[PDB]
Structures are given as C-alpha cells and as structure tokens.
Design an enzyme around this catalytic site. Sequence first.
Site, PDB file in Angstrom:
ATOM      1  N   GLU A 790       1.223  -4.251  -2.948  1.00 38.16           N
ATOM      2  CA  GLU A 790       2.484  -3.985  -2.084  1.00 38.16           C
ATOM      3  C   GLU A 790       2.389  -5.213  -1.019  1.00 38.16           C
ATOM      4  O   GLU A 790       1.377  -5.290  -0.438  1.00 38.16           O
ATOM      5  CB  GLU A 790       2.616  -2.649  -1.224  1.00 38.16           C
ATOM      6  CG  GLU A 790       3.875  -2.552  -0.538  1.00 38.16           C
ATOM      7  CD  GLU A 790       3.476  -2.552   1.123  1.00 38.16           C
ATOM      8  OE1 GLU A 790       3.115  -1.559   1.505  1.00 38.16           O
ATOM      9  OE2 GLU A 790       3.661  -3.630   1.691  1.00 38.16           O
ATOM     10  N   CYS A 824       5.230  -2.742   7.285  1.00 37.72           N
ATOM     11  CA  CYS A 824       6.021  -3.824   6.168  1.00 37.72           C
ATOM     12  C   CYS A 824       7.464  -3.191   5.971  1.00 37.72           C
ATOM     13  O   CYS A 824       8.125  -4.001   5.550  1.00 37.72           O
ATOM     14  CB  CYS A 824       5.074  -3.400   4.687  1.00 37.72           C
ATOM     15  SG  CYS A 824       5.321  -1.636   4.270  1.00 37.72           S
TER      16      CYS A 824
END
Length: 1209
Positions: A790, A824
Amino acid sequence: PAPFADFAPPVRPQSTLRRAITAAYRRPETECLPPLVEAATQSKEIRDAAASTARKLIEALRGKSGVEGLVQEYSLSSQEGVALMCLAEALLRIPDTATRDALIRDKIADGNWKSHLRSLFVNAATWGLVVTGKLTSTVNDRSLAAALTRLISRCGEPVIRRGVDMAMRMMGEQFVTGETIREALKRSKELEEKGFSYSYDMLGEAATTAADAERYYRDYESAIHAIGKASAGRGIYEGPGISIKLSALHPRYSRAQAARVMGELLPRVKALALLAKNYDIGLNIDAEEADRLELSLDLLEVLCLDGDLSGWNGMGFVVQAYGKRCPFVLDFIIDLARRSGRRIMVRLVKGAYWDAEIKRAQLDGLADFPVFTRKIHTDVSYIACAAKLLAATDVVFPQFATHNAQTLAAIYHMAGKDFHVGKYEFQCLHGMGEPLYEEVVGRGKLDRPCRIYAPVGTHETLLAYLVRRLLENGANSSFVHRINDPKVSIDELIADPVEVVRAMPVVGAKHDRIALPAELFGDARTNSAGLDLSNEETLASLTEALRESAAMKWTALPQLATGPAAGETRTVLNPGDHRDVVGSVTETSEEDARRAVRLAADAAPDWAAVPPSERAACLDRAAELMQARMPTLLGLIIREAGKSALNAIAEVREAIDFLRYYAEQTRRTLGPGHGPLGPIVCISPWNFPLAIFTGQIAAALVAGNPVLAKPAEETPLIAAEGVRILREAGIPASALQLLPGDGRVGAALVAAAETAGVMFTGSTEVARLIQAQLADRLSPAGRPIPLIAETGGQNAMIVDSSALAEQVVGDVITSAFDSAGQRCSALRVLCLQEDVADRILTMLKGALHELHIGRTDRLSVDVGPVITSEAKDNIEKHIERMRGLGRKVEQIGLASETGVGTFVPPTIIELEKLSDLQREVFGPVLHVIRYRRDDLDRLVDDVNATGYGLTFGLHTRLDETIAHVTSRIKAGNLYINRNIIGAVVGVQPFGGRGLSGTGPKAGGPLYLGRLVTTAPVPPQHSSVHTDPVLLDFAKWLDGKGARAEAEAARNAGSSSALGLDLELPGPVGERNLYTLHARGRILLVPATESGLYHQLAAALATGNSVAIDAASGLQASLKNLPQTVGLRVSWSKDWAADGPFAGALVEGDAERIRAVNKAIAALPGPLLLVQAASSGEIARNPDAYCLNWLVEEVSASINTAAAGGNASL
Ligand SMILES: Cc1cc2c(cc1C)N(C[C@H](O)[C@H](O)[C@H](O)COP(=O)(O)OP(=O)(O)OC[C@H]1O[C@@H](n3cnc4c(N)ncnc43)[C@H](O)[C@@H]1O)c1[nH]c(=O)[nH]c(=O)c1N2
Ligand SMILES: NC(=O)C1=CN([C@@H]2O[C@H](COP(=O)(O)OP(=O)(O)OC[C@H]3O[C@@H](n4cnc5c(N)ncnc54)[C@H](O)[C@@H]3O)[C@@H](O)[C@H]2O)C=CC1
Ligand code: PRO
Ligand code: PRO
Ligand SMILES: [Mg+2]
C-alpha cells in the site's frame, strides 16, 4: 516540560455533586431505571385523574393540513408535492414579488422551468419530510425533475401559485414565528393576550469560524435589545426571553478546548446575560450534544456566582431527560441555585439529538450510551425529574417543555392544587404545540401558563437544521406523530409509562434492536473499545497512565529467534520536542537480518503445524492484551510518533480490530490445503506504527508464515512493544522476529534467499525498489514472490452546491490536517463547485486558524508535529514552490514552543488545475481547486489522471451526482457526506489501486488468501452474475472446436466473484458497501494457444480487458473474434507504451517467468500483481490463475445521517 503534566486538567475541582454526574455518564440502562420509577410514582387517585385529563386533552386535539389539501386539490403524487415545494422555495429566493410573479406567468408556467431556475432540489429531504412524513437521506433529483415537469405541464400556473403561497406561509409563519426578531415580536401579541409567553430562538448553532461566532453574538445582542424593549418591564415570567446555543458563540466549543471556552466563550455569555439582566428578561442556555453537557455546567456555575449578574433571576438552563445524568445534573443545578441564591429557570426537555448520540457512541466504541434506548425510559426519566423539580420550586423555576399530553397531564396533577404565576410553567414549540396548549392556558382550561419557543430566521437559516427539528415530533415514537395516526387509540396514548416500565420483566433493559458498541459485529468478533475524552474520570485516569508511560525505559532490540542480538544503539526522540527522549533502539546488522531469515525458514514447518484455530487464538489473546494496555500504548504512540491522544486511541483500536478480524477470517477459511508461503518480511511505516505494523504481521502469522518484522526507523519502540505482546499471547519467538533499523535492514530482508513474501506499507519509490529486487527471484515452486504494497494517494474530495458548508468544512479540516496530514488517506485536493467556492473557502480558512498545533501531550492539541526534520523540509519546499508561483497560500502561525520539534503549520494552497499538483505531499497541506458544474465529469477524469486511487470523498445531496461520480471515480475507498479518514477494519476494508498499491485490501476478506499458496474461498465471496464477454468468448471457443477451453471459460465465468455487492455490518447512520469490479486492462504473456485461451478466460470472466504480448506469436490463435470480445482485446509489442495495466498473467517455464517478471517490474507506473503458471500447471490446475487477484475491491461508506437524522432509527 514534564510529559503529560498538563494533559487535561479540569476547569475546576469536581465537587461531590459534579462527580455524581460524571459517574452516571454511561451507567447501564437497567441500573438507571429503578430509582426513576420510584421517584416518578404517584397515587392511584392521581394516576386515574391524570389519565382522564390526558384523554380530555387528546379528545380535544383530535376533534379540531395545508400541504395535504394542496396535494389533494391537484392530485399530486408524493414526488410531485416535494418537487412543487422545492420550486416554491426557489421562487421565494427571488426577492422582488412582481419579478417573481412575472417569471411564474411568463416563463415557469409556460414550459421549461429548467432554463430559468444550484439544484432546485437541494432541500428536498426536508420537503420530503413535510409531504410524506418520511426522511430520505439523499434526493432523487431526476425523479423530482420529472415530477416537476409533469405537474407543471398538467396543472400550469395555478398549482405553482398555490405552492408558492403555501411555502411562503410555512417558511414565514410556521417553521418560524417571523423572519426577523421585530416580525416575530409583532406576531407574538395575539397569544400573549391569551396567557402565553415566548422564548425566542435565533436559530444559530455550530459556529465554524471566529467571524461566524461574532456574527451569532451580534445577532443575539440585537435580539436581546428588541425583546427587552418589547418586554417593557413585564419581568422574566410574564415577559418574553431569549434562548441561546453555546455552540453558536465559539467555533471550538468542546471539552478538549475547555480553557479557550472559559477564557473566550464565557465573557461573551456574560455580556449577553448582563444585557438580559438590565431589561429583566429570561436568557436560557439550550442543551446540545451529550459531550457538551458537563462543560456547559462550568459556564452555568461561573455565571451564577458572578456578582455582576446578581439581582436577576432570568438565567435559564436546559436539561435533557433522555440523558442518564439528568437527575444528578438537576441535583447539581438545584444546589447551585441554593448557593448562589439565583432562582435558576430549568427547562426540562426530553432531548433532540437521540439518533446522533446512538451513532457517536457506536463509532467511538464506548461502554454504553449516554442516553436511554427505549423511548418509554425517557418518559419515566422526565416524570421522575419533574418530581424532583416540583419539590424545589422555592429554589428553581421548572419549565416543562413537552408536546406529550400524557406527560403534561401527569405533571399537572403531580404539581397539585396550589399555583401562582412564577411557580412553574409549561413550554412548547411555535407552530406545533399551540393546539395542545390552547387546551391548557387560561382560566377556562387548566389555568397553567405556557412559554412558546419561537424560532426566528430567514429561509436559509431555518432550513439548515429543520430536519432535526421535524424529527423531534415526527418520528414513529413521537407523540405528535402518534396522535395523528388513526391506528393509535386514545387508550394507547394515555398509557402510563411509569407503570409499563415497572411491569416489564427486566426493568430498564436496553432496546432489543440497538447494539451496544462492543456488540456491533455480533457473533463474528468483539468490537474494540475506545475511551471517552469528555469523561473527567477517564481524563484523570488517563493522565496518570500517560505520565507513568513517560517514565518507562522503552527499548527496541533485534529480537532474533535465538534471543536478543547486539548492535548499534541510539536514542529515540519525540518529534514534537527532541529534548524528550522516549527510549533507545538497538538496530540490526545486515548479517543478523540475513540470519533472521534463515532462522525463520528453519522454524517455518513448526509454525505452520500450529492449527489455524490456535494461531487465531494467539491473535485474539494479543488483542485482549492490547485492549488492557491501551492507556500505556497511547502514551508511547503520542510521544514516539507525535500523535494526539484521540488518534492514538483510534490507532490502538485499529490494531485490536486487525487482530480480531484476521483471527475470525482464519476461523472461517483456513484448512490443511491452504499452505503457508514461508518467511514473510513485513516492512511498516512510522505514521501508523502500531496498527499497520500489527495488521501486516498478524495476517502473515495467522496464515501460518513466520514473520520478520522491520519497523520504520523512526518508530521502533511501539513495534517492539507490539512484538512483546504478540509473544506474550503465544506467538513463538521463532515465528516473530523484530529487526529494528533503516532501509538497509529492510533491503537485506527482502533480498534474503528464503524470503517467501513481502508486505510493505510506505512510499511508491521504495515499493518499486522492492518489486525490482523480488523480480530476480522465484519461490521454490518457480512462482513469483508475492508483494502486498500500500503506497499512499493523491486523495480528492468533490463538493457541489447542494452540500452543507459547515459539514464540508468540518470533514475537510479533519481529513486534511488530522495527524498532520500524515495519513495515506488524508485529503490532498478539495474540489469546490464554483458557485459555493468562495463561501466554503472563507469558512475553511477561518476554521484553519482555530487549530491548536503543538506537542501532543495536551488534550487541547489538534495537530502534532511531522515525523522528522527531513519530512518537514520536503513539505516546506513544496509550499514555497507553490508560493513562488503566485498561488494563494494560507497558513496558521506556529507557537514558539514548536521550535524544539519538527512542525509544519496546516496550510491551504489554491491551485488553478489539479495537474498543478504533481506528487503526494505527505503533510498538513490542502490544495483547493474550483470547477464549473458542467465540468464535473472532466474533473473526475482529472482526479483519476494522477494515477493514484486510494481514498475519495463526495459531498452532495443529489442521487444523480452520487451515481455519476461513484460510477466514474477509480478509487478503493469512497466516502459520501463524511470525512475520508479512519477506515474501520471489516467495515471499510482499506486499500486502493494504481499507484496506491497492489491490494488486496487490509481489513478485508481477500487479505489472508494472498499469504498462502492456495487461496481459500473468503466468506460471502461469490457472484450470480456472469460476464457477457466471457460468455461470448466461450461460445467462440466452442465454434473453434476448443471444447476443453470453452468448458474452462464457462467455469471461470461461474467462479468469478465479479459483481459481488454486499453491505457490511457497522454503526447506525452509515451504510458500508463492499463490491468487486474489474481491475482494468490485464497484461497477458502467454506461451501456448491453450495457455492464451485460459488466460483470456480468467481475465474476461473478471470483467477485464487485456493486452496480449505480440512477441508470443499467437496472433493466429484469435482469428474471427466476436466484436464484443475484440473490443476488450489488444496486442502489445511495447508493454511500457500500452499501459498502465492493472495486473498480469504469465505462462512459461521458470526462466521465462523470471524474465517476464523482470520486464514487468521495469514498466513505469503502478506495481502489477503478477500471476504465473507453467503450461503443465494450466493443464493440471483449473485454478492455476486465481480469480481473487483479477478483480478490484471497492469500499463505499455513505453517511446516511447527513440530512440531519437517521430514518432507519
Ligand atoms: C420549548 C421547547 C424547547 C426545547 C425543546 C422542546 C420544546 C417544546 N427541545 C426538543 C425536545 O427535547 C424534544 O425532542 C421534543 O420536544 C419532543 O419531545 P416531546 O416531550 O414533545 O414528545 P415525545 O413525548 O413524543 O417524546 C419524544 C422524545 O423521546 C425521546 N426518544 C425517542 N425515541 C427514543 C428512544 N428509542 N429511546 C430513548 N428516548 C427516545 C427523544 O428525546 C424524543 O425527542 C430541546 N431538545 C434539546 O436536546 N435541547 C434543547 O435546548 C431543546 N429545547
Ligand atoms: N503509505 C503510507 O502510509 C506511507 C507512505 N509514505 C510515503 O513515503 C514518503 C517517504 O517517507 P519514508 O519514511 O521515506 O517512507 P519509506 O517508504 O522510505 O519507508 C517505509 C518503510 O520502508 C523501509 N525502507 C526504506 N527503504 C527501503 C528499501 N530500499 N528496501 C526495503 N525497505 C525499505 C523503511 O525503513 C520503512 O520501514 C512519505 O513522505 C510519504 O509520501 C511513507 C510512510 C507512510
Ligand atoms: O451558600 C450559602 O452558604 C448561602 C446560603 C444562601 C445563599 N448563599
Ligand atoms: O483510513 C485511515 O485513515 C487509516 C490509514 C491506514 C489505513 N487506515
Ligand atoms: Mg525512507
């Protein structure tokens, strides 16, 4: 400064009476009711007399609407009635009456209303409540547009005229007493002459900026003058008064900002109270959310003890009987009235925020609710609290605000025979309670006074929170609703709630259909528990636990299978203050990292032999340990990672949720045939140093793999503690080794010969470097080494002109600046429709300047430091580049105390186009662009064009816009009418596409299957839908004579879960959806004709298009394809030119696979999830290519309470 020495000291020492309030905050419902039943008990004679009076009032109410007559006269459908009122609302936005009438006659009635009139239907949810009595959270604007055209073409000007006049009456005379205080005062004389009184509600609440709070202040001040002039010496009982909301008077009205509240909000209330004193009018403080109750008591106390206000008894205060603290609050207030000698005016209400309180307690994982969950419990609480108030009329002035005739009758007889004006009163809402109270006020009725709560405001102001007001009396349990329901008898309405509760089998049981926060997921798993930072007991206990955590000698060492290893040792510093040494880390030599992988490989069979249920038991035990250790874990995360307490709580919750979720998913799936990969290297970042750290490791471990855990070099201490906990929970030392250090340690682990899989969360550049190294190798079985990465996002939120600015600004400030923008998922690009951009931008800048930035060991800090000086430098270089290009930059000023740490001020940068922003800027930096409505589809293209695809937000009320945007956006986590951060494990499975990573989603059902050699079937993972291009391809294969491949194609079509569409369990007031879509264009690298057919079948069955390697030489194997299939097929010579791809399928021997894997890793852009198989494997194994990895997961979380209430509740 000593850590946590000033974390959250209370405004004042908590008295015995104050402590009894806090003690009741979340008391179990079965414990609250018995004392309320006792206090609410009355004699049989009184109960019979009260039932008679209530029946009499109800018979009067039933023996004596406008919208309904309009619907009937013109035979309107529901949607037509709603559309008509929306049109009337828009026509009323035209100020000149003659202009409006001309538009109606000459343009609206004649044809296309669309060419002459911001959607007309922005407030259709409100008008839907008016017309149908039902709340729909979003607006079907295409249905309303059709309905409006139909009704205008059918009925013409007369229906428009009637709708305009109806809306004008409702919005000027019914939902408000008047548009302005002077108009409201003029309209109050009629009922004052009948014995009513008034309290004016200026409809202000939830200031977002200082300027808005100042505006609300001057509005209250001007109203006090008008009311006081009109009162003309009538005094606080006969004459009118005002009601205020504290949330209108300060933009940071919360316990976390208590010092600012007492310093800045209190003087403002005092100034208004001094003016109310001079005119001798009432000034009532309205009650708001449960987390503001106790804070408001500190203002009430200071004001009642302030000698400048002495001689005036007009100070009033609301208490909400739906709240478990209500009788204890009343005890406190009555005592304060005694000590101060002020006859406090106490308005007893049931409570206006019920559905929001249920949702908030569930979201926060708290022990119980701060309100009752059965409506009858609130009714008993109200009557019990009325008994307490009626025994104290010498000390307080009770004001019984209710529209419930049974509640009224009970209190009327409870108060007995003696009455005088000033002893107590009833209260009701303007345009709602007059029918009932005209049977109460006056010598000819019950001869008891009633004060009318009178909203005052323009159309815009009243519409803002009209839904919540409508639901007060409009829900299925509401008296006003039930009296208007023919199926509800008078006997049902006069039922005594006190006796009904007393006879229930379990007195005070929680509602059967409302889950306690711990029980949100039922039998699947236990929800993690949070902490209430509005609870003084919690703040006091946390203060001590946090201080104790700062005294500990935290360490992190290379914990190899054989024991701790020696290495280079250095200190770990608090990013908010480098003088605060948090602990010491001993970092791993490259030699010991390679040794650790060898030890993991040697230990791999022994860990794989622990049955899946027992591996899951370890995770569950670790979750219990983390839950119990939460306060100490909070302290470490706060100081090591620079996080706020609020965010640290949520992070520990997320870690607990990962452990329990992966344990349950294991129990649902893993069997003997799902063999482990082998040693897995888990590389984790500093921004979620416990949760993502724990999630990756727990998944790998529970799937049967030994783990090498390489935490971010900035945050090794919480990682070492997480490993200590997992080992205490039963994970053997050989199964979980901790290797602290920098990227060199990560690289040594990745390159180690026995590494069988890598889980990585961090930058795209590093994931790409890891991919390039892994491409050099194959597993012992000759297959690529799996990489789960990720890698962040360039996350956008689109806001149209139907959204509510205050909601938007709150979600934007949170999404962009929470955690200093170091999520994020953080909001990077806000996109504002041009017509609302300036207003929202002004509000956003004002809200920005209310944020407190500093070292995070204080509850009042909203935004902490960035992780390092290098991170700070990189973010600031971006800001200054933007500034140098002449873009407008707004920044908050930083306090001098920030100099000892690494801080970046929250920043807003206005861009011309989304392409002005070229890379992810991992800090508290929001970029704002504007768009014209017709360019929405192009804007969605612009968002997709960055190549990222992680989180995405949309604020709109309009179904057409939701459908358009969500169907065209390409991101993994979508959020509608809420913030875009804080994905919840198992509720919003988290992860994206493109440059945002490979998948599968963490906290989702496909995750564990990537960590075993043969993937299981996840729970609920299937689809009844068959891709039609797959079907066309299978028919083509049959026509070519490739009957075996045609059968395999049909089997892939059935096996594919493309089209899965599920709703996941979660909190009330939200719908959380999980769907499987095509990934995109899959690169096919075949070697044989049959291999190509199998690859095509796999990709088409999962909805994808393909690019087939032209170097395969297999073009002649695909002659005469159906057009439907050809549309999905291209041939690629230069793979780098024909991307981006979303995955790859490779056929060949081991050396061919290695060569192709290296070529694929060299392609620019996203990391491709590659699956490879030999020709023989394709022939032997129907699942040689697993379809789990050829679909894309999408999570969507829709805030269904966004319209102001929860229809389901
Ligand atoms: C003059 C005046 C002034 C105010 C208010 C009302 C009036 C008349 N209100 C609103 C008030 O709290 C309440 O929501 C409405 O008056 C409706 O309640 P009734 O007693 O009229 O009706 P009714 O008897 O039908 O009671 C409805 C109430 O029951 C409660 N309820 C519904 N379902 C429940 C469930 N499943 N479990 C537990 N309880 C449930 C809710 O409190 C709901 O509003 C308020 N409110 C506020 O919070 N702060 C304020 O400052 C004011 N100000
Ligand atoms: N997706 C996310 O949540 C994160 C994304 N990032 C992005 O990365 C940028 C840089 O921050 P960094 O901390 O430099 O992240 P980074 O990605 O360099 O570090 C991430 C992890 O990878 C390890 N690592 C670094 N180089 C490696 C290598 N060559 N081989 C193996 N492991 C290696 C680090 O030690 C750390 O454990 C941030 O500004 C942000 O844009 C960083 C951290 C969090
Ligand atoms: O608090 C006290 O002691 C006095 C009693 C009357 C009002 N104040
Ligand atoms: O959604 C969020 O904000 C966090 C970030 C990592 C995954 N969950
Ligand atoms: Mg780095």
